[PDB]
Every structure is written in C-alpha cells, then in structure tokens.
C-alpha cells in the first residue's frame, strides 16, 4: 500500500526546549548556548514519507512509530532504526536495504538496546557521536496544545560515532530543525525548566537576555550592536601587464637543437597560467614538479621556459629522475620541480613521410649530463681504441639528426616539447597571476569591500590630491581612509561600514511588551 497524506507549514511557538545538560539548578536563570528550535519558527506539518535531511537535529513532534536515522537509505551505511512497539521501546541498528517504504513487518551491523491522541515530542540530536534523544510524551488536550511550555528531558546517549544525514517516520510528524541559538532558561526551585527566552528573537527578548531576567523595568537598555555587509570588490593592482613568453613556447614553430635547450628567462609578467589549462590533449600534462594546479596562482620569478625538439624515446627520459637514453647523454632533469614540462608528439610538424633527418641530437655524447644544465656544449664522445681525440675511428658524432619517421612508434615520432623551471629564492619574483577587475569599483553602497590593500568598509570616490606617486592615505592615526584605483586614477576615500549600539526603550514588561529601538 501507499497510504500517504498532506503537508502544511506551522509556527513553531514557544516550545522545543530540552534540558541541555544533566546538571541540577534551582531558582537560577541559566544562559545556555546549545542547539535549540528557535522560537516562533516554521515547522512542516506533514500528514506521507519524505526523505527529510538532518540539519543538526529535529524537534520531531507527533500525534498518532519509528524512524530510520541513517545517511543513505539502504543496506550500506548502518542506518539506525528506532521503534516504539509496546513490547519494548527498542532499536534496530542495522542496514536492511530499502525497507519497502515502511514496516518490514538486516546486515552485519551493530549492537542493540532496549528499554492522533497526544504529543510524543522528540528532539533527536546527534553531536560528534552520541545521537541523543531528549523527549517528553505530553498527553496534550487534543489539538489545543501545539504550544505551551514543556521541556524535553534526555532519554539516552547511545555513543555512536556514525554520521547521520536523513530520516523519516513509519506508521503528527512536525519536523523542525535545530539551530545554534542562545536561550535563557528559568529553573524553578524544584529544578524544572519553567520558561525560556530566545535571545535573538526580537528586541525585548534580547533585552531580557542581557539583563538575565524575565522582567525588565522601564528604561533604555544597550543590548547589543549592529553591522555586517558582504559584497566582494577586488579591483586589483595591475591593468594590462604583459603576459609572458607563454603561448610562445606552447605555440612556437621552430624549437632549438636538443642540447641547446632554449631556456629563456620568461618575462616580467602577467603569467597568469590558465592559458595552460585550456589546451587540447597534451599527452604530457603531468606536472613534473608541484601539482599541475597553482602555477597561475603562485608567483615565482621566472620558470625559464625551455624549448627543444625530441622524438618519443628521448621524450620518455624528459622527467625528474627518469634518467634514460637522452637524459643519459643529452637532456637531463633534476630531482623535481622541472616547472610543468608539457610534451606532445609533433608528427605532422617535424617529420614528413620522407622520414625527416633534420634536428640534431647527441647520443654517445660522452655520458649523462648533470641534472638541468644548458648543453650548447656538445662535447664529443670518448670512444677509445685511439689516444688522439678520444673518438674511436674518427668523429664520433654527438650530432644525431633525430632521424625519425611518421611510420615509427611515437617513441620515434617527431616531438616538439616545452619545458619549465621556476626560480624563487632571490630578489622578489617577477612572474605571477593575480585576479583583476571585480567590478565597477562600486562607489557608494557599503560594498566596495576591498581595494588592492585589503579594506572592509563603505568604499566610494573622494576629492583628495594624491601627489601622483602616493597611492593610499592614512589619517592622523594609521587608518587608511583613502585609496586610488589601481587600474584607473580614482582617488577613492574609504569610510567604515557603520555601527552603533542598538538600545531598546521599554515601558517595562509590567506595563506592556512593546519596545522602541
């Protein structure tokens, strides 16, 4: 069957408050900070099985059995399964893939435990384990009391390190969601919570909650203060700074002879790398060094972009560690941090099916060259059987026209390859990738909530005359109340957001309960 029913939306009145701790107190007015059901909030009067996320707790009333208190709805996740069935108010702590919707009437799960007429109230609350089940079954007078003050004495801790996110009933049903709100509970002398005051409900309540009392006399009380405002304006120092030699090695026509690794010192900058990420399949994007991210963001001086051609069997050796035939005679790379070397085959681009014999490399140069040099030095090979020039017969070429073919392996396909190697120790970096141009600097509307230097305030235009090298301006005491737009001229003087002290004017809760603010 599917016996479902309707929904609603009701005003969760002054109720949903539970003894937050096992501590007795008498004739006090405590001021807690627990998670409660804020006063006069909205409860969703279900009449009909929903999936109901677990936003930190539930003031779960009812009027007419059990609940599934897991995160996923299946045989996976150890979904806790309560039940109150007049034999024992006991549990089920197993998985049990998708009980049909309700009422099965079991997996390798867990332990177990045992123990429309009225108001079986329930504030289930899970906090880093210990899914706690404060409750009170109030035999209400029918429909007349969906409000009236009642506290929810705990029932059990159940230390369960499990992460709940969902739940639902099976065989009323006002799900309300707990939030972090400070209350002012009023214990009588017997020890019971007879009242409460949601401190952030309204001005009057907030006043009671700073006077720590339930009745305030006439007067004007300074309760709290007031201001926040978000809107991010992050107008940035640069305007049109030169990019980089990037998109010049990634997109060059003729690279260097392989041992003459065309390292440059990549130029001043806006080397805001993202033009990196866009490219079509690289077949070598694996950042040989730090993660293939963060290069746009990090600011190193130069990454010394090298430029050379290879063919795949040599390209295999182009990596930190990974010493091999060409990083065993010609082109070696250090322990790490070879920038983000980006190899790719250049079939159509460096060899024709004539089997191009163009670009000279050095196998049998002498031996492996030491990590990351520039090898315009193409020292000839010690080949023995002769003292004169070392070279064995005569002229042992470390000049190997790469001698490949588009019909080989890509180990022997043409390969044009870009290399990087960043510098960051000495006099401050040149290359980096800040953002820019949030917006239209956002003169008034206390929004223009940064500028270059981080500021948070009303930030608009001014009428100062900043001596055209001076950029921001202090007041007599070291608070910058002026700034110039970086990308434009715009002498903007800044001013702080706003604030004060909300003071609450009341005739005294004996006369009335209206307040002026």
């Amino acid at each position, epitope marked *: 069957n599917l016996i479902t029913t309707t929904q609603s939306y009701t005003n969760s009145f002054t109720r949903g408050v539970y003894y937050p701790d096992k501590v007795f107190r008498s004739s006090v007015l405590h001021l807690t900070q627990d998670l409660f059901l804020p006063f006069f909030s909205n409860v969703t009067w279900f009449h009909d099985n929903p999936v109901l996320p677990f936003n930190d707790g539930v003031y779960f009333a009812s009027t007419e059995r059990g609940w599934i208190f897991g995160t996923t709805l299946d045989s996976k996740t150890q979904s806790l399964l309560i039940v109150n069935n007049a034999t024992n108010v006991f549990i089920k702590v197993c998985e049990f893939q998708f009980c049909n919707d309700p009422f099965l009437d079991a997996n390798n799960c867990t332990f177990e435990y045992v123990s429309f007429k009225n108001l079986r109230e329930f504030v289930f609350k899970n906090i880093d384990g210990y899914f706690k089940i404060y409750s009170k079954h109030t035999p209400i007078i029918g429909r007349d009391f969906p409000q009236g003050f009642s506290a929810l004495e705990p029932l059990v801790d159940l230390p369960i390190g499990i992460n709940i996110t969902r739940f639902q009933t099976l065989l009323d049903y006002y799900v309300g969601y707990l939030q972090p709100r400070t209350f002012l509970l009023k214990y009588n002398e017997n020890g019971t919570i007879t009242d409460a005051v949601d401190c952030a409900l309204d001005p009057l309540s907030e006043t009671k909650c700073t006077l720590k009392s339930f009745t305030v006399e006439k007067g004007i009380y300074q309760t709290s203060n007031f201001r926040v405002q978000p809107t991010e304006s992050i107008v940035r120092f640069p305007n049109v700074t030169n990019l980089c030699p990037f998109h010049e090695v990634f997109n060059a026509t003729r690279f260097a002879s392989v041992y003459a690794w065309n390292r440059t010192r990549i130029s001043n900058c806006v080397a805001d790398y993202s033009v990196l990420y866009n490219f079509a399949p690289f077949f*070598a994007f694996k950042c040989y060094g730090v993660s293939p991210t963060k290069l746009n963001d990090l600011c190193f001086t130069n990454v010394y972009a090298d430029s050379f051609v290879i063919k795949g*069997n040599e390209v*295999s050796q182009i990596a930190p560690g990974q010493t091999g035939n060409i990083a065993d005679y010609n082109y070696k790379l250090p322990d790490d941090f070879t920038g983000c070397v980006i190899a790719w085959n250049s*079939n159509k681009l460096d060899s024709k*099916h004539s089997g191009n014999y163009d670009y000279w490399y050095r196998l049998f140069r002498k031996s492996k060259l030491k990590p990351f040099e520039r090898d315009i030095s193409t020292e000839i090979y010690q080949a023995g059987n002769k003292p004169c020039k070392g070279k064995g017969p005569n002229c042992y070429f470390p000049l190997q026209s790469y001698g490949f073919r588009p*019909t*080989y*392996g890509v*180990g*022997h396909q043409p390969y044009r390859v870009v290399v990087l190697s960043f510098e960051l120790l000495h006099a401050p970096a040149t290359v980096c990738g800040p953002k820019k141009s949030t917006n239209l600097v956002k003169n008034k509307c206390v929004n223009f909530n940064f500028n270059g230097l981080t500021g948070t305030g009303v930030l608009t235009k001014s009428n100062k005359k900043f001596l055209p090298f001076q950029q921001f301006g202090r007041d007599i005491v070291d608070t910058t109340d002026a700034v110039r737009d970086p990308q434009t001229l715009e002498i903007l003087d800044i001013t702080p957001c706003s604030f004060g002290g909300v003071s609450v004017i009341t005739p005294g809760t004996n006369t009335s309960n209206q307040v002026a603010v």
Partner: antibody
Amino acid sequence: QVQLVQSGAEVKKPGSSVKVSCKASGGTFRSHVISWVRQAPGQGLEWMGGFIPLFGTTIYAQAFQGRVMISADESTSTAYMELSSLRSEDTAVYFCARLFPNGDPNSPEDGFDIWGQGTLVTV
Amino acid sequence: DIQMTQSPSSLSASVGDRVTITCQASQDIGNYLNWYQQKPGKAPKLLIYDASHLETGVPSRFSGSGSGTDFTFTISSLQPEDIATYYCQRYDDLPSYTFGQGTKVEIK
C-alpha cells in the same frame, strides 16, 4: 624480427568479457602502443581499440565507444582487449598488430604493421 | 570521424583489367589515407600510406595513387594470387582506425 605473440582462439558468450592477449615476443613493445584489431567475421574490418600504455590514457574503439575497456599491460608481457559487455557481435578474428603508431627505431622493415595471429571469437 | 568508406566499393576485375580502386571517404583526407588489403587466412596488410608510397612488401601491383577527395589504389597488373579484399583504414593523426568494406580484385 618481432612477432607480437597473441593468445589463441576461443568463443565467448553474451554479457561477459572476452579476454585475449597480445603477448611480448622478446622486448620491442614499449613504444609499440598495443592497439587492437578486430576483423569483423567476413562482412568487414574493425579496430578493437587498444590501450595507450605509452605514458598516458587509453584510446577506445570507435565502433563500440563506451564499454570497450581496452587495457593493455605491456611490462607484464600481455596485452588485453578487455571487452566487458560482449554479446554476439564479435564472431571475429581480433588481431594484435603494431598499429600505425607502433614502429621501432629498429625493425623498420616490419614498418608500422607487426601483425599478430588472431583470435576466433563467436557466441 | 570522416568515418571511412571507399566509393568504388566492389570493383570486380581479373588479371590486369585496368584498375581503379578509390577510398573516397565521406570528406577529404589530404595526406591521411591508408589503403588496406587483407590477405585471407592471415593478418591484414597495410600496403600504402597517405595517397601513395607503398610499404616495403606487398609488391607494386597494388599501386597507390590519387590526391583529392578520392585516392586511387589502382592495380597496374595483378595475378591470380592478388585476390585481396580492398577495405581501407584511414590513419587519423590521432588514432581512429576506420577501416573499409572490401573492394576485392578477383580472378575467374
């Protein structure tokens, strides 16, 4: 020179996977990206898809495009077609070849095709 | 893909039989044309690569030609053994391997 020893010839049945191996004949596999030939029974040709163990991700067969899970583990001296979700369509002689991107700097006479042996799959 | 087809698809011809076999694809191939022929009871044989320039092997009889949309793998002079089904793969510069249908050159 190089032979690219392939597994054999057996039939495989629907839903499951068909395993075959282009096995390593005395080195000469590293560049040699072991792609995979299919050779539809007698209606037409095909390319089973292969893996790209040359330092990157794998290409999948155009013909089947999504459950051609063609893995190939060159160091282990075995290739694979690894076609999960087979039904019947196979009935073919899937070859292992040195498909065009698979020449060595050696063996240029076996240029850009060092073919295999073939595997009769069917129902 | 250009999703390789050949168009003549079933050119029937005996010994010599001035030949025209052309792997005209859906669209243009440029210098990205394989021309295949399969040797029955064995593994395939790629004779020609882009438009021309036969492999060392599978002799000149099967001769590659044609540069345009349609690339002509004409036989100058076959013999009884040149029964070989003329499908055509297309080496796409990133692997795509779309083979053909079979333009078998016959004998009686």
